[PDB]
Design an enzyme around this catalytic site. Structure first.
Site, PDB file in Angstrom:
ATOM      1  N   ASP B 178       0.810  -1.213   0.000  1.00  0.00           N
ATOM      2  CA  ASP B 178       0.000   0.000   0.000  1.00  0.00           C
ATOM      3  C   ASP B 178       0.841   1.260   0.000  1.00  0.00           C
ATOM      4  O   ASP B 178       0.641   2.132   0.839  1.00  0.00           O
ATOM      5  CB  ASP B 178      -0.891   0.026   1.236  1.00  0.00           C
ATOM      6  CG  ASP B 178      -1.889   1.159   1.216  1.00  0.00           C
ATOM      7  OD1 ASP B 178      -2.458   1.423   0.133  1.00  0.00           O
ATOM      8  OD2 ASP B 178      -2.098   1.784   2.280  1.00  0.00           O
ATOM      9  N   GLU B 429       3.389  -7.596   7.733  1.00  0.00           N
ATOM     10  CA  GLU B 429       2.152  -8.290   7.369  1.00  0.00           C
ATOM     11  C   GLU B 429       2.280  -9.443   6.368  1.00  0.00           C
ATOM     12  O   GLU B 429       1.550  -9.484   5.378  1.00  0.00           O
ATOM     13  CB  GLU B 429       1.148  -7.261   6.834  1.00  0.00           C
ATOM     14  CG  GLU B 429       0.826  -6.168   7.862  1.00  0.00           C
ATOM     15  CD  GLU B 429      -0.245  -5.207   7.389  1.00  0.00           C
ATOM     16  OE1 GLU B 429      -0.352  -4.983   6.166  1.00  0.00           O
ATOM     17  OE2 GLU B 429      -0.998  -4.695   8.242  1.00  0.00           O
ATOM     18  N   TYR B 489      -6.947  -2.825  12.940  1.00  0.00           N
ATOM     19  CA  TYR B 489      -7.825  -1.795  12.418  1.00  0.00           C
ATOM     20  C   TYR B 489      -9.285  -2.073  12.760  1.00  0.00           C
ATOM     21  O   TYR B 489     -10.178  -1.815  11.951  1.00  0.00           O
ATOM     22  CB  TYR B 489      -7.634  -1.679  10.911  1.00  0.00           C
ATOM     23  CG  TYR B 489      -6.289  -1.092  10.526  1.00  0.00           C
ATOM     24  CD1 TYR B 489      -5.162  -1.898  10.427  1.00  0.00           C
ATOM     25  CD2 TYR B 489      -6.155   0.264  10.252  1.00  0.00           C
ATOM     26  CE1 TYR B 489      -3.936  -1.371  10.082  1.00  0.00           C
ATOM     27  CE2 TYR B 489      -4.930   0.806   9.894  1.00  0.00           C
ATOM     28  CZ  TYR B 489      -3.824  -0.019   9.805  1.00  0.00           C
ATOM     29  OH  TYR B 489      -2.600   0.509   9.444  1.00  0.00           O
ATOM     30  N   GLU B 524       0.697  -0.492  13.935  1.00  0.00           N
ATOM     31  CA  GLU B 524      -0.276   0.211  13.085  1.00  0.00           C
ATOM     32  C   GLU B 524      -1.676   0.190  13.684  1.00  0.00           C
ATOM     33  O   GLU B 524      -2.111  -0.830  14.240  1.00  0.00           O
ATOM     34  CB  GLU B 524      -0.363  -0.400  11.681  1.00  0.00           C
ATOM     35  CG  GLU B 524       0.859  -0.253  10.813  1.00  0.00           C
ATOM     36  CD  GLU B 524       0.630  -0.792   9.414  1.00  0.00           C
ATOM     37  OE1 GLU B 524      -0.554  -0.900   9.006  1.00  0.00           O
ATOM     38  OE2 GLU B 524       1.630  -1.156   8.748  1.00  0.00           O
TER      39      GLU B 524
HETATM   40  C1  LIG Z   1     -10.800  -7.369   8.660  1.00  0.00           C
HETATM   41  C2  LIG Z   1      -9.289  -7.307   8.690  1.00  0.00           C
HETATM   42  C3  LIG Z   1      -8.738  -7.152   7.278  1.00  0.00           C
HETATM   43  C4  LIG Z   1      -7.216  -7.074   7.284  1.00  0.00           C
HETATM   44  C5  LIG Z   1      -6.743  -5.700   7.738  1.00  0.00           C
HETATM   45  C6  LIG Z   1      -5.448  -5.338   7.023  1.00  0.00           C
HETATM   46  C7  LIG Z   1      -5.167  -3.854   7.197  1.00  0.00           C
HETATM   47  C8  LIG Z   1      -3.890  -3.455   6.481  1.00  0.00           C
HETATM   48  C9  LIG Z   1      -3.521  -2.007   6.793  1.00  0.00           C
HETATM   49  C10 LIG Z   1      -2.287  -1.638   5.984  1.00  0.00           C
HETATM   50  N1  LIG Z   1      -1.091  -2.198   6.594  1.00  0.00           N
HETATM   51  C11 LIG Z   1       0.194  -1.953   5.946  1.00  0.00           C
HETATM   52  C12 LIG Z   1       0.341  -0.495   5.504  1.00  0.00           C
HETATM   53  O1  LIG Z   1       1.459  -0.394   4.610  1.00  0.00           O
HETATM   54  C13 LIG Z   1      -0.937   0.020   4.835  1.00  0.00           C
HETATM   55  O2  LIG Z   1      -0.800   1.389   4.427  1.00  0.00           O
HETATM   56  C14 LIG Z   1      -2.083  -0.137   5.828  1.00  0.00           C
HETATM   57  C15 LIG Z   1      -3.339   0.557   5.370  1.00  0.00           C
HETATM   58  O3  LIG Z   1      -4.180  -0.030   4.525  1.00  0.00           O
HETATM   59  O4  LIG Z   1      -3.605   1.683   5.773  1.00  0.00           O
END
Ligand SMILES: CCCCCCCCC[C@@H]1NC[C@@H](O)[C@H](O)[C@H]1C(=O)O
Ligand SMILES: CCCCCCCCC[C@@H]1NC[C@@H](O)[C@H](O)[C@H]1C(=O)O
Lengths: 617, 617
Positions: B178, B429, B489, B524
């Site tokens: 991302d 991740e 999140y 995060e």
């Molecule tokens: C229901 C759970 C689904 C999985 C959740 C994964 C969330 C990943 C979040 C992402 N984690 C890595 C980061 O580089 C990205 O910018 C960040 C984002 O999207 O804001």
């Protein structure tokens, strides 16, 4: 007088001193001199080249008044300095600087936008050297650019409480100009070497004459160019080779050095490839001072082209040019006024994307690298000194006059060899009109500066003065320039939002300039515009209004054959002192500060795509 | 193995090659070899250091797939290269590069975020040299960071029209991550010299033991540090002097060099001044190889401090530390992933303004200068390799495994001496959970990398793996790390907008981690937030919702004594591949891309001001 940009070759090396320095704020009118004797106590980090003001959010350095002190250490191999002349060069320190090396004051400088240097051959020593640079940000009635000694800022907003509060307010720079007073080591710092006994100090290349220019101006049957090489130090000779775009030597002469050591002469080039807007071509003049080694050398880029004002036309290589572009600023989010070549490269690409062909260095000479960039990218420049905010208070001050002459001479000495520069601007929006003796006083002040600009430039390019929206009937100075450059905001600052009335007023003044009979161009016109504000009938600050503004005004100037250019204000939104008319700075950019196109930028791109560099009028 | 940053002193000189280079785009899987043999035809300008993608608005370089070619000329004095070892260093070329000098292949490199260099002693010649650098931006199933070989992008949006159109679509990089795939010469390029016969190739300083640390951790009665100096080239000795913050020699030893030439030993520092978060202190280890003209030297900065995980605590100098901060990115408006020290300096000041004390180099090693900056500014770093986007397809790929080991060894070799670094992250991740053999396969892939990180670091810092929001009950890898680092999140990507439910789910998983007995921190958590969007009852994308999000989540983790840190996502809005959930990129920044504070940043600043670096839990 010569300030050739530092070069590395077999006789010369450049040692950059950019990076993260130590930094401390100091007093309103002083700093501790003993900071030059030892490492700064409790230093802050500060990147250089860069303005210091937006490099620390714990402090409010935009509000800082007075002195700051930079410092760093450096070391170079003894064998590298051995027998060499050692020069420490500051591309720009804004606005004034005192420089110390190992506790010794090398000297001072005041121009905030032009380079200065010191011979440090004797002050250097082996191992770590301590370089301390005090930088003064103060502006006032005797500086260029001009500040106010009391009162309010540029375009700023009876009550006793106010008088008393004003008298005790924290001291601030009160600028007579519409851009933020970014200060510090805005441009590169570097140590460099030359031979000590004799060395090349300056080079001037000029296009003296063109014979039988091709119809497309790509070539001329013959080009007469002149060279002028100055030497420092102390039957000596310098060899001059002219290299084409492929590095092929197409001409060469060996000239005698005559004593103030100088060599000068002319060179004829058949089928010379000319430099044009939108079609750059560059040669290199290699100067080699003659006696696995040899002696001093310098490579000076240049372009072959002529510039001539003839009646109401502006001729480049004998062709009637039309300016398409804008005033710019060296301005960006973290750097402030700091030079940023990523941004320069991007901006030049944007100038092409817009199908513009030119800009003005409003309101100070820009970083040297930007002129090299425009040389190779075929973008035309009006080069302007920092004489902005001037009025009658300044014209009567001999120190101001001397600083103005210094700025003109300095700019032209630095920038004379760039083919992209086609015109000099000696001021932006000075007071020129009024009654009594004021117009005559303004004329008597600026006329010798006009003359100085012509005398200093070996190419003898046209000279202008960028004129404020004033009483054009009592102004007697602007009409005497080689090109009339006007800043007009009909429909924004007056007749506000009424484009019919704005166009009417504009046409009345255009009848005046038509009668004046000089070539005329816009160097500013525009409307503050917040991206994302929209309307079906665009009002002031909407994207649509900015677009409508340019469509209406430009339709009016298209009717005037003597109107030879349109430079709008501004290329991009930029930072200013805070105030009731400044929404996060000046928003007259056709691009946002992050270089994104507002509606007006798309409209202008379409218009400019259909306007040729040559022969539009 | 050693990659000491180029240094200038009496034995060494650095010649920077940054500036405006020539540039051409090339093919999807090739470039013209003759471009390395002669000047590029019709070149574009391109500033370096910098991503190329946002440096030309005439082209759409963000859409570019495959190769580009950089080129420039340079010349240095013969007397400076004479008898020296000449090394050409690339701080970073993203992602892969072929390097040519004067028509000769120097070699190639893969890995977009770590430095590489070539010995150019024999390829250099007098006068102008022609340096050509081909740079490949392609990502796929075998690169780190990981791309997809087919399909759609990270968080991207059967129908025959679609299948058929997809098969014929223009080839694009398809990131499994991302952040936008910014490519090119993202960091500095420089030529440098060392002595040829024998030279310092590597230095490692470690804090071996602290005896009787003061109550305030400012000093220790004694510090035992170890040194390890490696030499290249060929009764020889190296002198090692330890300099305190004022440059005073507080300790010194002369050590014997034994053959792989190496000198190693220990030094006791009495009343040692310790490095702490919020209170940096730096020493210099000067290594001088012993025999005008002398021999070789290097000055290595270090800080004296210990790091130890003990039960559920994270001890710095024996004190229980609490992380306050965020993941960052090297990302900015024109530079892209290009290093910008003005921005680094500003960002560090903002970290202080926020009263944060730490960040992670998500998701790749950062420019070296940023670690020097954090060393001197007392900001703690979690150093992370570009192993982002990984899943089971990668674990079975030998080339991926080797590149991963390369990234870990390269990162630690480059960064081992920074006191600010307290922990390594070996991935972000990756897929770790599921059924069948998948968890075991993931464990067997990552465990030896965990071990490699421990073996490579002479300081033996804790090692983590930043874990995706997954099935924590089947993940058998994350719980074996030294520190459990989780990205969660709740309330954003699930239980969307329901903070009660989000906090409930969070508390259930926290009940799980409570029993694991490892220290746990957020690396995060956050919410996309468009500055200026407001509501009395904040919904997703409003400033209020971001604020509420952190208020609720942080109130929950405050109840857990074993929760030792909060690093949110993200420090600042940053560029991503375009898509339906990316509003001008990722907007989970608590600061805007231009580093302006959203409401949540003010709230967080207030919270963090009341949380001490030591003893919070
Ligand atoms: C229901 C759970 C689904 C999985 C959740 C994964 C969330 C990943 C979040 C992402 N984690 C890595 C980061 O580089 C990205 O910018 C960040 C984002 O999207 O804001
Ligand atoms: C009727 C009175 C008209 C007043 C005309 C003065 C206009 C000056 C415009 C200003 N001219 C100079 C420039 O630096 C500034 O950024 C620009 C501006 O304000 O946007």
């Amino acid at each position: 007088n010569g300030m050739l940009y530092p070069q590395s070759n077999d006789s010369r090396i450049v040692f950059p001193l950019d990076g993260v320095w130590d930094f401390r704020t100091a007093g309103e009118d002083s700093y501790p001199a003993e900071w030059a004797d030892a490492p700064l106590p409790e230093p802050l980090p500060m990147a250089v080249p860069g303005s210091y003001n937006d490099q620390n959010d714990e402090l409010n350095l935009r509000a800082h008044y007075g002195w700051v002190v930079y410092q760093r250490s450096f070391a170079v191999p003894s064998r590298l300095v051995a027998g060499q002349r050692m020069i420490l060069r500051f591309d720009a320190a804004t606005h004034a600087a005192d420089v110390y090396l190992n506790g010794q004051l090398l000297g001072s400088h005041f121009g905030g936008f032009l380079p200065f240097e010191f011979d440090v051959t004797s002050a250097l020593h082996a191992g770590e050297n301590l370089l301390t640079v005090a930088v003064d940000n103060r502006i006032g009635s005797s500086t260029l650019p001009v500040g106010n000694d009391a009162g309010t800022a540029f375009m700023g907003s009876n009550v006793p409480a106010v008088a008393e509060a004003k008298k005790h307010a924290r001291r601030q720079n009160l600028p007579n100009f519409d851009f933020f007073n970014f200060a510090g080591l805005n441009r590169h710092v570097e140590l460099y070497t030359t031979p000590a006994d004799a060395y090349i100090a300056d080079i001037a290349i000029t296009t003296e004459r063109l014979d039988h220019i091709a119809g497309d101006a790509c070539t001329a049957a013959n080009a007469l160019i002149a060279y002028d090489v100055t030497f420092g130090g102390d039957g000596r000779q310098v060899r001059i080779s002219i290299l084409d775009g492929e590095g092929t030597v197409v001409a060469g002469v060996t000239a005698d050095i005559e004593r103030t050591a100088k060599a000068s002469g002319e060179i004829a080039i058949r089928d010379a490839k000319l430099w044009n807007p939108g079609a750059a071509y560059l040669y290199t003049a290699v100067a080699e001072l003659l006696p696995s080694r040899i002696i001093d050398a310098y490579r000076q880029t240049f372009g072959i082209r002529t510039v001539e004002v003839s009646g109401t036309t502006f001729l480049i290589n004998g062709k009637p040019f039309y300016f398409k572009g804008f005033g710019k600023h060296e301005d960006s989010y973290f750097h402030g006024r700091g030079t940023d070549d990523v941004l320069n490269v991007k901006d030049v690409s944007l100038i092409h994307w817009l199908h513009a062909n030119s800009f003005r260095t409003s309101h100070y000479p820009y970083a040297e690298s930007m002129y090299d960039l425009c040389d190779r990218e075929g973008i035309v420049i009006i080069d302007e000194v920092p004489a902005v905010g001037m009025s009658w208070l300044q014209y009567a001050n001999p120190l101001v006059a001397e600083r103005h002459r210094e700025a003109i001479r300095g700019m032209i000495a630095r920038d004379k060899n760039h083919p992209c520069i086609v015109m000099w601007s000696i001021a932006n929006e000075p007071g020129l009109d009024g009654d009594g003796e004021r117009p005559r006083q303004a004329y008597d002040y600026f006329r010798p500066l006009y003359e100085l600009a012509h005398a200093s430039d070996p190419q003898n390019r046209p000279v202008t003065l960028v004129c404020c929206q004033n009483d054009y009937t009592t102004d007697i100075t602007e009409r005497t320039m080689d090109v009339v450059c006007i800043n007009r905001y009909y429909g924004w600052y007056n007749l506000s939002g009424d484009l019919d009335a704005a166009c009417h007023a504009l046409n009345i003044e255009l009848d005046f300039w038509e009668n004046i009979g000089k070539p005329v161009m816009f160097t500013e016109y525009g409307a503050d515009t917040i991206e994302g504000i929209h309307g079906t009938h665009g009002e002031m600050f909407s994207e649509e209004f900015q677009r409508d503004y340019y469509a209406r005004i430009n339709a009016e100037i298209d009717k005037r054959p003597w109107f030879i250019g349109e430079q709008l204000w501004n290329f991009a939104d930029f930072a200013t002192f805070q105030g009731i008319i400044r929404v996060e700075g000046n928003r007259k950019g056709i691009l946002t500060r992050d270089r994104q196109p507002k509606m007006a930028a798309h409209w202008l791109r379409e218009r400019w795509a259909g306007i040729p560099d040559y022969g539009y009028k």
